[PDB]
Scaffold this motif. Structure first.
Motif, short mmCIF file in Angstrom:
data_model
loop_
_atom_site.label_atom_id
_atom_site.label_comp_id
_atom_site.label_asym_id
_atom_site.label_seq_id
_atom_site.Cartn_x
_atom_site.Cartn_y
_atom_site.Cartn_z
N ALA D 140 0.81 -1.20 0.00
CA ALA D 140 0.00 0.00 0.00
C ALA D 140 0.86 1.27 0.00
N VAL D 141 1.94 1.28 0.78
CA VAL D 141 2.80 2.45 0.86
C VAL D 141 3.51 2.67 -0.45
N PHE D 142 4.11 1.61 -0.98
CA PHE D 142 4.83 1.74 -2.24
C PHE D 142 3.92 2.27 -3.35
N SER D 144 1.04 3.83 -3.27
CA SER D 144 0.43 5.14 -3.11
C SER D 144 1.47 6.23 -3.26
N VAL D 145 2.70 5.97 -2.82
CA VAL D 145 3.73 7.00 -2.82
C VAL D 145 4.42 7.08 -4.18
N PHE D 146 4.85 5.93 -4.70
CA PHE D 146 5.61 5.97 -5.94
C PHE D 146 4.72 6.00 -7.20
N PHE D 170 12.29 14.77 -0.54
CA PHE D 170 10.86 14.45 -0.62
C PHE D 170 10.15 14.73 0.71
N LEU D 171 10.76 14.34 1.83
CA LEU D 171 10.19 14.67 3.13
C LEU D 171 10.00 16.17 3.30
N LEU D 172 11.02 16.94 2.94
CA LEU D 172 10.95 18.37 3.16
C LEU D 172 9.93 19.02 2.23
N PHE D 173 9.93 18.63 0.96
CA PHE D 173 8.89 19.04 0.03
C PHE D 173 7.50 18.90 0.64
N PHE D 174 7.20 17.74 1.21
CA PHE D 174 5.86 17.47 1.71
C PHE D 174 5.51 18.34 2.90
N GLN D 175 6.52 18.81 3.61
CA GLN D 175 6.27 19.72 4.71
C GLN D 175 5.93 21.08 4.18
N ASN D 179 2.14 20.51 3.99
CA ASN D 179 2.05 20.56 5.45
C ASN D 179 1.65 19.20 6.00
N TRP D 180 2.40 18.18 5.56
CA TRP D 180 2.02 16.78 5.73
C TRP D 180 2.00 16.36 7.18
N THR D 181 2.85 16.97 8.03
CA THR D 181 2.82 16.65 9.46
C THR D 181 1.47 16.99 10.09
N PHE D 185 -3.99 11.42 8.81
CA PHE D 185 -3.64 10.09 8.35
C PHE D 185 -2.15 9.81 8.54
N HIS D 186 -1.29 10.83 8.35
CA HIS D 186 0.13 10.68 8.68
C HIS D 186 0.30 10.42 10.17
N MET D 187 -0.43 11.17 10.99
CA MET D 187 -0.31 11.03 12.43
C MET D 187 -0.66 9.61 12.85
N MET D 270 -3.05 3.59 7.05
CA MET D 270 -3.61 4.92 7.20
C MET D 270 -2.77 5.97 6.46
N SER D 271 -1.45 5.90 6.60
CA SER D 271 -0.61 6.89 5.93
C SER D 271 -0.79 6.83 4.41
N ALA D 272 -0.86 5.60 3.85
CA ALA D 272 -1.15 5.41 2.43
C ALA D 272 -2.35 6.23 1.98
N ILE D 273 -3.45 6.18 2.75
CA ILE D 273 -4.67 6.92 2.43
C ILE D 273 -4.43 8.40 2.38
N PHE E 172 9.61 22.30 16.50
CA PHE E 172 10.92 21.88 16.97
C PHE E 172 11.66 21.07 15.90
N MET E 173 10.97 20.13 15.24
CA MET E 173 11.74 19.28 14.33
C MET E 173 12.05 19.97 13.01
N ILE E 174 11.32 21.01 12.64
CA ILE E 174 11.65 21.75 11.43
C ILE E 174 12.84 22.65 11.67
C1 CLA Z 1 8.36 10.71 14.32
C2 CLA Z 1 8.72 10.79 13.06
C3 CLA Z 1 8.08 10.10 11.97
C4 CLA Z 1 7.61 8.82 11.84
C5 CLA Z 1 7.62 7.69 12.78
C6 CLA Z 1 7.08 8.73 10.46
C7 CLA Z 1 6.52 7.56 9.92
C8 CLA Z 1 6.06 7.45 8.63
N1 CLA Z 1 6.14 8.40 7.62
MG1 CLA Z 1 6.50 10.40 7.99
N2 CLA Z 1 7.50 12.24 8.12
C9 CLA Z 1 7.89 12.83 9.27
C10 CLA Z 1 8.13 12.13 10.48
C11 CLA Z 1 7.86 10.81 10.70
N3 CLA Z 1 7.19 9.95 9.86
C12 CLA Z 1 8.13 14.25 9.06
C13 CLA Z 1 8.60 15.19 10.08
C14 CLA Z 1 7.88 14.51 7.75
C15 CLA Z 1 7.96 15.78 6.99
C16 CLA Z 1 6.60 16.18 6.44
C17 CLA Z 1 7.47 13.25 7.17
C18 CLA Z 1 7.26 13.08 5.81
C19 CLA Z 1 6.92 11.87 5.24
C20 CLA Z 1 6.70 11.58 3.82
C21 CLA Z 1 6.96 12.49 2.70
C22 CLA Z 1 6.19 10.31 3.79
C23 CLA Z 1 6.19 9.81 5.15
C24 CLA Z 1 5.84 8.43 5.23
C25 CLA Z 1 5.82 7.77 6.41
C26 CLA Z 1 5.49 6.30 6.61
C27 CLA Z 1 6.57 5.44 6.01
C28 CLA Z 1 6.06 4.04 5.92
C29 CLA Z 1 7.19 3.15 5.51
O1 CLA Z 1 7.67 2.24 6.17
O2 CLA Z 1 7.74 3.40 4.27
C30 CLA Z 1 8.82 2.53 3.81
C31 CLA Z 1 8.54 2.17 2.42
C32 CLA Z 1 7.81 1.11 2.09
C33 CLA Z 1 7.21 0.22 3.11
C34 CLA Z 1 7.53 0.78 0.67
C35 CLA Z 1 7.96 -0.62 0.26
C36 CLA Z 1 9.34 -1.02 0.76
C37 CLA Z 1 9.84 -2.32 0.10
C38 CLA Z 1 9.32 -3.55 0.81
C39 CLA Z 1 11.37 -2.25 0.03
C40 CLA Z 1 12.14 -3.54 -0.12
C41 CLA Z 1 13.61 -3.26 -0.27
C42 CLA Z 1 14.31 -4.30 -1.11
C43 CLA Z 1 14.08 -5.69 -0.55
C44 CLA Z 1 15.81 -4.09 -1.27
C45 CLA Z 1 16.42 -2.80 -0.76
C46 CLA Z 1 17.92 -2.96 -0.87
C47 CLA Z 1 18.73 -1.68 -1.03
C48 CLA Z 1 18.49 -0.67 0.07
C49 CLA Z 1 20.20 -2.04 -0.96
C50 CLA Z 1 5.40 6.15 8.14
C51 CLA Z 1 3.94 6.04 8.59
C52 CLA Z 1 5.46 8.00 3.84
C53 CLA Z 1 4.00 7.68 3.87
O3 CLA Z 1 3.14 8.17 4.63
O4 CLA Z 1 3.68 6.71 2.95
C54 CLA Z 1 2.37 6.22 2.77
C55 CLA Z 1 5.74 9.23 2.93
O5 CLA Z 1 5.59 9.26 1.73
N4 CLA Z 1 6.60 10.74 6.01
#
Ligand code: CLA
Ligand SMILES: CCCCCCCCCCCCCCCCCC(=O)OC[C@H](CO[C@@H]1O[C@H](CO[C@H]2O[C@H](CO)[C@H](O)[C@H](O)[C@H]2O)[C@H](O)[C@H](O)[C@H]1O)OC(=O)CCCCCCCCCCCCCCCCC
Ligand code: CLA
Ligand code: CLA
Ligand SMILES: C=Cc1c(C)c2cc3nc(c4c5[nH]c(cc6nc(cc1[nH]2)C(C)=C6CC)c(C)c5C(=O)[C@@H]4C(=O)OC)[C@@H](CCC(=O)OC/C=C(\C)CCC[C@H](C)CCC[C@H](C)CCCC(C)C)[C@@H]3C
Ligand SMILES: CCCCCCCCCCCCCCCCCC(=O)OC[C@H](CO[C@@H]1O[C@H](CO)[C@H](O)[C@H](O)[C@H]1O)OC(=O)CCCCCCCCCCCCCCCCC
Ligand SMILES: CCCCCCCCCCCCCCCCCC(=O)OC[C@H](CO[C@@H]1O[C@H](CO)[C@H](O)[C@H](O)[C@H]1O)OC(=O)CCCCCCCCCCCCCCCCC
Ligand SMILES: CCCCCCCCCCCCCCCC(=O)OC[C@H](CO[C@@H]1O[C@H](CS(=O)(=O)O)[C@@H](O)[C@H](O)[C@H]1O)OC(=O)CCCCCCCCCCCCCCC
Ligand SMILES: CCCCCCCCCCCCCCCC(=O)OC[C@H](COP(=O)(O)OC[C@@H](O)CO)OC(=O)CCCCCCCCCCCCCCC
Ligand SMILES: CCCCCCCCCCCCCCCC(=O)OC[C@H](COP(=O)(O)OC[C@@H](O)CO)OC(=O)CCCCCCCCCCCCCCC
Ligand SMILES: CC1=CCCC(C)(C)C1/C=C/C(C)=C/C=C/C(C)=C/C=C/C=C(C)/C=C/C=C(C)/C=C/C1=C(C)CCCC1(C)C
Ligand code: OEX
Ligand SMILES: [Cl-]
Ligand SMILES: [Cl-]
Ligand SMILES: [Fe+2]
Lengths: 34, 65, 32, 341, 334, 34, 81, 30, 36, 38, 37, 36, 36, 33, 30
Positions: D140-142, D144-146, D170-175, D179-181, D185-187, D270-273, E172-174
């Motif tokens: 779902a995450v992959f 929805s995001v990619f 990408f994280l900073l862009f979304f902020q 204002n993704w924080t 659904f992110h929360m 939820m975050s996916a949504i 704070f985190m920004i």
């Molecule tokens: C307390 C801090 C905190 C926490 C806990 C989270 C937690 C989360 N954030 Mg948020 N974030 C935060 C702060 C935080 N954020 C802040 C301050 C910002 C700035 C606005 C953001 C901006 C942000 C963005 C822009 C996004 C998130 C996303 C997410 C989710 C990532 C889900 C995941 O596991 O993706 C990991 C990725 C996957 C699970 C996809 C599939 C992965 C496959 C299985 C990979 C397999 C790898 C393969 C086997 C080989 C790799 C090998 C190679 C490396 C060598 C999760 C709910 C994402 C989200 O909500 O997505 C729906 C998202 O896009 N966050």
């Protein structure tokens, strides 16, 4: 009596062969100057 | 169980539960329509996407006039 | 019509709360 | 004993790495996604799509190397090698961003293959398929995001690029932009990941600290036997401990381990949504009541208004370099800036 | 039978519904003081001049906040790291304007939370347990010390400690990112690995145990009724879970020893979170994330941007906007 | 161009060398496959 | 336990290392050459340090057409010849 | 009204805590 | 305020002494196995 | 008529077909040589 | 006609009620700010 | 057969990694990507 | 030590129907006055 | 504050409807045993 | 909103009528 070539053999060399080649290319790169 | 006029009419439409053709039956023929349908969905997708471009097929609102 | 907009919530809770009370008592009755 | 059965026999043989029918989708696609990413990050640039260097060959390191998205001008082109954009030229294909779509699509079909593998092995072994189910969350995450997020936008250009620092960008862009924080659904995702990590740690520590003494040695690992009937730690003592420390405890090992599945999986869903919403710029950007009051009352200030000044900074200061196709020219005098800085 | 010894017996009794203990003797008052002040302040505190520039930030519900925007606001930059108990203010009105309540809450909480960790040791000893559950909680506790105490100490002001609110947290985190490039810091990257990995292994472990529950029930009842609290037999088949997971990868990447497996579950998120708490604690002394700004230039010397330069443009916009009225000189040195 | 044969000569020699060192044992496995 | 030869028994074996003390360096050297010859730049289109800009240029050569994009980057590369 | 709503819900959660702890289903062995 | 300061100093000293002397009152012996 | 992208399409369609068929030709062959006993 | 044999009793234990109420109350606590906006 | 003791393989392999990784950190300071 | 005074409580279907009707009709009656 | 009037009814129902559902099912569970 | 509310309540009563008639407690001769 073990086989030499297996599915296992293939997956290993699938990864290891280009890993080294890649490592060699990346080593060469540390000596590029602008 | 309760018999009804309409029930007695539809009866044979719900009478062959469990019946199968032997072996693979028509599976090879199904597979051919599945393959054709994929290629056709590909075409439809790639036309919409504009990686398939065709004469007189103008994938724009400007095809209403 | 410039009606009292707290009227919607008063009417809604007026119905919901006592009705829920009855339903709770009736269902636990049917299961013993 | 037809041939389909013969191949099923062969696919499903017990070997060091199981193959399965799922292996036919999984293994080519997994290897090609992974190979594309190692290939692009070692050798391939982002100069023509992005104005950036992005490979070891160009002098980038492991944090800054990336397979960058295609140029905004490519729209949502599949960017097939044989397609009208690259016209079969490998070299041009690489320079136009073709490896991004290569990686994202082969990646998506690998994910499917991997989840089919979880299904296939679970059916052959005779266990329930809850590990496949749980894996729906990463999928779902992959997607929805990619996939979904940039498909709602102008082009693939605005999806994440496959790189450490590109992802940080990408994280900073979304902020700044979404204002993704602020998004509930992110929360819920945050609570799901953080609560997952807590559960992981608290369950591990509890087991290790309510162990039964089943051996004489100081290393307690040796005194487990994978085929013993007996629980290796005391649920009873664990439950009294946590009831007395925290007020409530688990009493039911099945519920506990289901809850461990439930929490991080749901959070990711939820975050996916929420990211689906942002595909459409449907953000929780603002609180209307705050803005009306603040527009009228210049003495009213909250952390909500302080954070939007920062978003505003982010956008004006990063936009020109981060969206070069827009040819943004912001003269000095229009940049928002506090005093002195 | 003596008075003190009967008191000691009750303090340390394993029979209280909630264990007290000697750590409890400090924990309970301090967490009640911090809780009660927090709740009242969150609802009704007046605005606080966090940054010492006579620009008060409204944090409480009755002053026009919601659950998402409200906070107990950090105390004034004019105070810095000076101790500001109530009795040092001319009046409560002053103490409120300058952000007294934040200090009261964080000092009582960090105390009570330190005693919480100790209470975990203690009851572990009274019950004949192994003792290190408290070591796992030291990871979250270290994290709370970093953002409430250590980072203020290094930057010289509780005004830079983390606000007690949802949007204050984001603020704070920004600001942290603009001032320390925390994303590009390896210890934060290990935090993410500890936290992503933690949620992953949580899901994995739960799905594997759940996949191998032994049939004890019918399709019309929750499987959970197949386990009875205190039963001696294990309730799932670990060899079946090993057999599935080792074939999903390969045999030797899978755990057949439940002790090693559960110790792994404990150590991965704990160690990752230690490092990320260490990240905040050392960025508190301005040993910041990797800086690769303009690290790539061409044969002539034109800067060739990378993704790190793009990150910098975003950090710059955070830098120049935050605390937009508080800086009079060109460098933000703390 | 010539760089490709440059690049590929070690890999060809490497496979050549490994083919020669393992060929005897590889036929013992192939015979055993009926 | 599945019938392939244990890894620990392969990498200590004399035969193993007889092959792999050739095959590993050859690949490491093959990859080197791929870069030192310059071939990697040409296969991938990757600019060399001297060829991101023309001499008095500070414009990125950004692709801006979808179906003429191939022709665009070809244009930017002649603007350096 | 929004202030009352926020505090009301929060107050319900605290009350729930009370019952969840002191009026739980008491775990019973085997 | 000075009355508040006094009161808090007193309450704090009280609890900290409970704590010090509580652990001084043979804490190692208050376990379920070997008491000393 | 028959545009370049239509030619590209058929190119891709045959390349996929080659790849999948080749893949399955190999697997059918291996699975016939190295069978389970029973 | 016989009474229907597929009918089954439904259960919600006390723990599930506590978990369920916490979920709803915390959900409400989170979304209420957005509802008032 | 089992002739090279495994501990020797590990040391040489291990040192081989250290070597290549060291080269990569040296390259962070020399040539492309060094800021110079 | 369970309390001997506990009693079970009952509400039959007819009482639910009458009670619901009472509530609904009271709502339909007073709602106009609540909106005013 | 100038806040969405319907937020209140929405919040109350959001809380009330699912909570009453749960209570109904719990109480009739206790009347069984 | 007020029109919707009056119509909703009226509609619930009509549904009550249906159940109270057709799904009553049947009277029997004990
Ligand atoms: C307390 C801090 C905190 C926490 C806990 C989270 C937690 C989360 N954030 Mg948020 N974030 C935060 C702060 C935080 N954020 C802040 C301050 C910002 C700035 C606005 C953001 C901006 C942000 C963005 C822009 C996004 C998130 C996303 C997410 C989710 C990532 C889900 C995941 O596991 O993706 C990991 C990725 C996957 C699970 C996809 C599939 C992965 C496959 C299985 C990979 C397999 C790898 C393969 C086997 C080989 C790799 C090998 C190679 C490396 C060598 C999760 C709910 C994402 C989200 O909500 O997505 C729906 C998202 O896009 N966050
Ligand atoms: C969970 C399990 C997941 C398992 C799935 C495994 C992955 C399979 C891979 C699927 C690949 C799908 C990619 C589709 C590409 C895309 O869409 O490509 C986009 C094209 C349309 O192209 C875009 O079209 C846009 C609109 O153009 C129009 O507007 C212009 C201005 O008016 C002009 O008039 C122009 O001529 C006219 O065509 C812009 O022009 C963009 O630049 C152009 O790229 O659609 C098309 O290919 C087809 C679009 C309709 C088909 C439905 C697509 C379904 C996916 C979308 C669902 C999310 C919806 C997003 C909402 C958020
Ligand atoms: C099963 C494994 C697998 C899967 C699922 C994919 C899937 C994909 N690949 Mg990948 N690929 C694979 C293996 C795989 N590949 C392998 C092994 C290689 C190495 C050669 C590659 C190399 C590769 C490249 C280089 C590229 C892809 C691309 C693609 C994408 C487009 C594919 C397409 O349009 O097909 C179209 C074709 C089909 C779907 C085949 C349909 C077959 C029909 C059913 C039969 C027709 C038979 C024929 C007409 C009859 C005979 C005719 C007559 C002459 C006798 C897609 C994501 C492209 C991409 O990622 O784009 C960015 C791309 O550029 N692949
Ligand atoms: C996907 C993106 C992502 C992800 C996964 C993370 C992940 C993380 N970040 Mg990063 N971050 C991101 C993006 C991301 N971040 C971005 C984009 C930015 C810049 C804008 C930052 C800026 C950033 C900063 C500035 C900080 C983090 C921190 C963290 C960690 C937060 C969790 C934590 O501290 O637990 C640790 C546990 C706790 C804090 C919990 C303490 C619990 C106490 C002891 C008990 C509380 C009791 C409670 C009050 C009552 C409950 C009882 C109940 C009855 C009420 C975690 C490793 C933080 C960190 O490393 O802190 C050490 C930190 O300060 N990040
Ligand atoms: C960034 C975090 C993150 C990563 C890296 C990750 C990785 C993984 N999770 C897996 C599993 C799981 N993940 C689970 C829950 C979760 N996973 C999470 C987060 C992650 N999970 C979270 C938070 C949860 C909690 C719900 C479960 C329950 C499982 C499993 O059962 C499974 C497993 O076995 O783990 C033990 C493995 C799937 C293997 C696979 O598909 O191979 C096949 C490989 C394929 C198909 C290639 C994918 C290609 C990708 C999609 C695109 C290319 C990516 C580039 C090559 C690399 C880019 C790097 C830059 C971004 C820096 C893999 C190790
Ligand atoms: C418990 C769950 C909820 C139960 C159902 C709740 C609805 C019950 C009905 C509430 C009254 C409905 C009033 C209309 C709603 C409204 O607008 O009120 C809203 C009014 C307040 O009025 C509001 O005030 C605002 C300023 O604060 C503005 O003026 C608003 O315009 C105005 O609406 O609510 C009340 O005034 C509270 C009621 C207290 C009345 C006590 C005196 C009555 C005592 C007599 C009782 C005798 C009963 C005998 C029966 C036998
Ligand atoms: C069975 C057989 C075994 C199969 C092998 C499987 C290999 C697949 C694994 C791929 C590893 C990807 C890492 C590549 C790093 C590299 O090449 O750096 C290559 C770069 C090269 O270094 C750069 O070189 C340039 C040359 O022009 C410039 O000189 C730059 O200044 C210099 O930094 O090295 C680094 O950046 C410095 C070392 C840091 C290495 C990264 C640390 C490891 C990171 C974690 C590994 C990823 C896994 C994540 C897990 C979660
Ligand atoms: C452009 C198109 C490109 C894509 C096309 C790719 C085609 C994919 C084909 C991949 C199949 C490779 C694996 C089989 C090779 C192998 O050595 O096994 C068959 C032989 C191995 O020997 C035997 O090995 C057997 C073990 S096992 O099955 O390998 O596990 C054992 O049973 C037996 O005794 C022993 O003799
Ligand atoms: C002295 C210090 C004491 C600290 C006091 C803290 C007490 C509060 C802790 C929880 C009470 C409520 C739990 C109810 C729910 C309840 O009673 O659950 C009880 C439940 C019992 O589980 P069992 O395994 O017994 O249940 C088995 C079967 O009955 C399942 O059907 O425990 C769990 O499921 C553990 C996971 C729940 C984890 C929930 C904790 C989250 C609470 C914190 C969230 C607060 C957000 C608030 C923001 C305002
Ligand atoms: C993080 C978890 C790991 C914790 C460490 C402990 C693991 C516990 C092991 C089980 C019990 C103890 C046995 C100890 C034994 C032990 O720890 O491992 C040793 C084992 C080597 O085993 P050998 O067959 O050499 O010898 C038998 C051993 O048991 C020696 O004791 O290592 C391997 O598996 C090497 C192969 C990895 C290389 C494979 C590359 C090819 C993969 C391609 C396919 C990709 C993945 C699949 C596709 C999705
Ligand atoms: C840094 C460090 C710390 C921990 C210890 C450790 C020693 C691991 C360590 C070092 C590890 C290092 C630096 C690892 C580096 C590994 C690397 C560079 C490996 C590279 C592997 C590359 C591979 C497969 C490439 C595969 C490429 C493929 C398919 C490409 C396929 C294709 C593409 C992409 C386009 C279409 C055409 C085609 C052929 C289909
Ligand atoms: O306060 Mn809070 O924030 Ca750490 O830097 Mn300087 O100060 Mn202010 O500025 Mn940037
Ligand atoms: Cl600020
Ligand atoms: Cl200043
Ligand atoms: Fe467990």
């Amino acid at each position: 009596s073990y086989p030499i070539f297996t599915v296992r053999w293939v997956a290993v060399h699938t990864l290891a062969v280009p890993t080294i080649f890649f490592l060699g290319a990346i080593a060469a790169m540390q000596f590029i100057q602008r | 169980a309760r018999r009804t006029w309409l029930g007695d009419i539809l009866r044979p439409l719900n009478s062959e539960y469990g019946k199968v053709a032997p072996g693979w039956g028509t599976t090879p023929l199904m597979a051919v329509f599945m393959g054709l349908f994929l290629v056709f969905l590909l075409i439809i997708l790639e036309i919409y996407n504009s990686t398939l471009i065709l004469d007189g097929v103008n994938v724009s609102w400007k095809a209403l006039g | 019509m410039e009606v009292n907009q707290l009227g919607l919530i008063a009417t809604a809770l007026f119905v919901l709360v006592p009705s829920v009370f009855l339903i709770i008592l009736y269902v636990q009755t049917e299961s013993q | 004993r037809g041939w389909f059965d013969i191949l099923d026999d062969w696919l499903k043989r017990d070997r060091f790495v199981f193959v399965g029918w799922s292996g036919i989708l999984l293994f080519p696609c997994a290897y090609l996604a992974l190979g594309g990413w190692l290939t692009g990050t070692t050798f391939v640039t982002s100069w023509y799509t992005h104005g950036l260097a992005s490979s070891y060959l160009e002098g980038c390191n492991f944090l800054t190397v990336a397979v960058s998205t295609p140029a905004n001008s490519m729209g949502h082109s599949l960017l097939l090698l044989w397609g009208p954009e690259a016209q079969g030229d490998f070299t041009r294909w690489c320079q136009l961003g073709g490896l991004w779509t290569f990686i994202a699509l082969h990646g998506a079909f690998g994910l499917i293959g991997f989840m089919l593998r979880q299904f296939e092995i679970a059916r052959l072994v005779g266990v329930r398929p809850y590990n496949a189910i749980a894996f729906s969350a990463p999928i779902a995450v992959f997607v929805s995001v990619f996939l979904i997020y940039p498909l709602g936008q102008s082009s693939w250009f605005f999806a994440p690029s496959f790189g450490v620092a590109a992802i940080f960008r990408f994280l900073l862009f979304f902020q700044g932009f979404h204002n993704w924080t602020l998004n509930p659904f992110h929360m819920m995702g945050v609570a799901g990941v953080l609560g997952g990590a807590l559960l992981c740690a608290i369950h591990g520590a509890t087991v290790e600290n309510t162990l039964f003494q089943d051996g004489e040695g100081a290393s307690t690992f040796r005194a487990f036997n994978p085929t013993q009937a007996e629980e290796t730690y005391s649920m009873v003592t664990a439950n009294r401990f946590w009831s007395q420390i925290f007020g409530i405890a688990f009493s039911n090992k099945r519920w506990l381990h289901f809850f461990m599945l439930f929490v991080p999986v749901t959070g990711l869903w939820m975050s996916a949504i929420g990211v689906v919403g942002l595909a459409l710029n449907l953000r929780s950007y603002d609180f209307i009541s705050q803005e009306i009051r603040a527009a009228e009352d210049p003495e009213f200030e909250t952390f909500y208004t302080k954070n939007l000044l920062l978003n505003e900074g982010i956008r004006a200061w990063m936009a020109p370099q981060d969206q070069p196709h827009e040819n943004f020219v912001f003269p000095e005098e229009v940049l928002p800036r506090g005093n002195a800085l | 039978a003596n008075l003190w010894e009967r008191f000691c017996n009750w303090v340390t009794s394993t029979d209280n519904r909630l264990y007290v203990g000697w750590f409890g003797v400090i924990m309970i008052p301090t967490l009640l003081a911090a809780t009660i002040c927090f709740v009242i302040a969150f609802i009704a505190a007046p605005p606080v001049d966090i940054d010492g520039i006579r620009e008060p930030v409204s944090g409480s519900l009755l002053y026009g906040n919601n659950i998402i925007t409200g906070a107990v606001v950090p105390s004034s930059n004019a105070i810095g790291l000076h101790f500001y108990p109530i009795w040092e203010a001319a009046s409560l009105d002053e103490w409120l304007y300058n952000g007294g309540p934040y200090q009261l809450i964080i000092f009582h909480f960090l105390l009570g939370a330190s005693c919480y960790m100790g209470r975990q040791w203690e009851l572990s000893y009274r019950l004949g347990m192994r003792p290190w559950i408290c070591v796992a909680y030291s990871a979250p506790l270290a994290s709370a010390f970093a953002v409430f105490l250590i980072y203020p100490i290094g930057q010289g002001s509780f005004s830079d400690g983390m606000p007690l609110g949802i949007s204050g947290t984001f603020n704070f985190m920004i600001v942290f990112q603009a001032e320390h490039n925390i994303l590009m810091h390896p210890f934060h990257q290990l935090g993410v690995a500890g936290v992503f990995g933690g949620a992953l292994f949580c899901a994995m472990h739960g799905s594997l145990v759940t996949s191998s529950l032994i049939r004890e029930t019918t399709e019309t009842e929750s499987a959970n009724y197949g386990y009875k609290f205190g039963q001696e037999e294990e309730t799932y088949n670990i060899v079946a879970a090993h057999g599935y997971f080792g074939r999903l990868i390969f045999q030797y990447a899978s755990f057949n020893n439940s002790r090693s497996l559960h110790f792994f579950l404990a150590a991965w998120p704990v160690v990752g979170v230690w490092f990320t708490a260490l990240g905040i604690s050392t960025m508190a002394f301005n040993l910041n994330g990797f800086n690769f700004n303009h690290s790539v230039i061409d044969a002539k010397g034109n800067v060739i941007n990378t993704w790190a330069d793009i990150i910098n443009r975003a950090n710059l916009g955070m830098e120049v906007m935050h605390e937009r009225n508080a800086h009079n000189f060109p460098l933000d040195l703390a | 161009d010539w760089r490709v044969l440059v690049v590929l000569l070690p890999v060809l020699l490497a496979a050549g060398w490994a083919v020669r060192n393992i060929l005897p044992y590889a036929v013992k496995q192939v015979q055993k496959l009926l | 336990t599945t019938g392939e030869r244990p890894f620990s028994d392969i990498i200590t074996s004399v035969r193993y290392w007889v092959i792999h003390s050739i095959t590993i360096p050859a690949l490491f050297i093959a990859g080197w050459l791929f870069v030192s010859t310059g071939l990697a730049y040409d296969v991938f289109g990757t600019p060399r340090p001297d060829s991101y800009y023309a001499q008095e240029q500070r414009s990125i050569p950004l692709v801006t057409d979808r179906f003429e994009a191939k022709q665009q980057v070809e244009t930017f590369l002649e603007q350096l010849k | 009204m929004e202030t009352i709503t926020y505090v009301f819900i929060f107050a319900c959660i605290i009350a729930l805590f009370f019952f969840a702890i002191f009026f739980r289903e008491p775990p019973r062995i085997t | 305020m000075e009355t508040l300061k006094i009161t808090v100093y007193i309450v704090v000293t009280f609890f900290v002494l409970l704590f010090v002397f509580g652990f001084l009152s043979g804490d190692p012996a208050r376990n379920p196995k070997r008491k000393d | 008529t028959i545009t370049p992208s239509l030619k590209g399409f058929f190119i891709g369609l045959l390349s996929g077909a080659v790849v999948l068929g080749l893949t399955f030709a190999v697997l059918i062959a291996i699975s016939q040589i190295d069978k389970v006993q029973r | 006609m016989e009474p229907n044999p597929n009918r089954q009793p439904v259960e919600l234990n006390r723990t599930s009620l506590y978990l369920g109420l916490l979920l709803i109350l915390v959900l409400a606590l989170l979304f209420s700010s957005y509802f008032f906006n | 057969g089992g002739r090279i003791p495994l501990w020797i393989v590990a040391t040489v392999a291990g040192m081989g990694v250290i070597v290549i990784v060291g080269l990569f950190f040296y390259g962070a300071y020399a040539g492309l990507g060094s800021s110079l």
